[PDB]
Amino acid sequence: SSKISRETLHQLIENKLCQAGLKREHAATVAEVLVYADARGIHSHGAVRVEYYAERISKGGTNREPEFRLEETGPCSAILHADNAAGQVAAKMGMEHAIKTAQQNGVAVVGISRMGHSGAISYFVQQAARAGFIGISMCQSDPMVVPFGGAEIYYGTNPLAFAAPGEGDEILTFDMATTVQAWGKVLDARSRNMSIPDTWAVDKNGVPTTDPFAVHALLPAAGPKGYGLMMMIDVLSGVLLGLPFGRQVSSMYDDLHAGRNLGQLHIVINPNFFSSSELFRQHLSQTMRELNAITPAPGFNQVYYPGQDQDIKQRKAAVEGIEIVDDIYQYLISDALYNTSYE
């Protein structure tokens, strides 16, 4: 394993995505959202995804000339038609509009209609926080989860993200998928014959397993609860947006030449429209401080506030760089667009 500066990694990704077809302005936005993930230790959403993105952009499955349209439907609501643009581009754009609206009218609910994969969604809610607002976000994902007590796939790992401002540079960020584990993990254990916890995934019959090769679908986190959340996220970023929903949602490998048509929903709340933002920021910082002060149980060195472990990594990254798997580096500096295909 190697470590590289944020800037070099940003450029490598940006150049790669340009070379595959995106306008540079687009490639650079995608890149920034990926570098963000890696600096926070979220490698699953980092530079490892560049090769698959390039293959898709290259084949027209991500729109390189999107026809954006921001349809404002009311004082605090709006839909950003993204014409299947890269999810990072679409979602950042949508959130910017939301921030604008909430800044003026206290609140904003903005839909992102027909986009590709937008990345670690904590990046978008952090936009809001850096602007001093509470930010909430969620989106649909590839079908991969059985409902509670079920044996067929229906919903995706539909993530939900949240972020709120503290004092100074302090931001509280919480991100979470609705399944116990992420499918990628099942594939890794697939790599190394390695076995897996009986809570991660279920088989074709819906029975849990320790055999990653026997896995057919993931399980919802905390059973009925995760299941209800993913359904909720599907209702808020899909059905509400008239987009495909549930098992109709496109999957990554369906058709690299076709837009994903995914939906995303942002909610922004301006604390000034509810009470002192100054006391809001002071109390969020106080929350951070207290939780972190709590006596840890055996097996723990400390108690971290939600997302703190990622904040620490992000800070270190801005100084020592970002860790990147050597193969990815070699892929980035090579001339290939994609070696292994997702066809």
Next chain:
Amino acid sequence: SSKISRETLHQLIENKLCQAGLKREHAATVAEVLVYADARGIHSHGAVRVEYYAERISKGGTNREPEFRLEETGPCSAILHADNAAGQVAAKMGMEHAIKTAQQNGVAVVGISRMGHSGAISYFVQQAARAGFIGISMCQSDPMVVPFGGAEIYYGTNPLAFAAPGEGDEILTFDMATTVQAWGKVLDARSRNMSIPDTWAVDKNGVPTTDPFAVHALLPAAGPKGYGLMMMIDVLSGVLLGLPFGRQVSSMYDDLHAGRNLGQLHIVINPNFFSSSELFRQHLSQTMRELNAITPAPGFNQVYYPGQDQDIKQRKAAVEGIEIVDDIYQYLISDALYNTSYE
């Protein structure tokens, strides 16, 4: 376990809350939210709590003459200062203002500032879905949970609810506590020396236990996830409203003479400002139907959609009346304000 009609139950409760000091109209509201709960099988939030509400109303711990004040802060935002009025009354008022705002302006975020316990929170989101809107609600609660990896309590079981309109009278209702299980359940097994799943609670050291008498605090659902979820709910319905938050949140049995000062946040979204409401409703009904037709796993006679089990119970209750514990029933028909004190 007698069986009585909602009408009878609702009247009994109403009278008893009146006798304690509440105005008929507020008691009527409290009673209907409580009957709602029992009808859904949510006994923990039903008539079992009348005795404790009577005693707090009697000692002034619940403002009997609340001076309500609805501060409209913007086009789609508002705060209902409740003056430590009864939670069912306050949350319903707020939701009403939310429903009206979203009707005109597509979206509404309303906070309920300083109220007592508002019962089964799914009741309020159902208000929104009966009106054809999407409803989301969440509120703070009595500190009972250790943070992920922690050994002292901080947050409460902070619940979350959501509901959306299907075709015709159909409604999809989802609600959830952020802990694996409710404190009540620890009490059940405790009041009957029954070991419990080591996922529910932890000992005084922060180490999960199987012995209910060893339970010192509850565990957050799915570990870090419910941990982030309770924090989010706390920031949204507490810190956002300038109310005590986290460990500051008042406990039920602390001071029967003091206002609880709880907060609650409602978010309503008018499907019309985002796409075809009739298509929305039609898709929600499709979601319900298809989840029901999913091949169930070995050990499930069938797959239910979120909250369906409670939907079933509610329907039946309106026909077969509600079951009520003898202890609770004889208390409601007697003239006593309460037979025991909740400290």
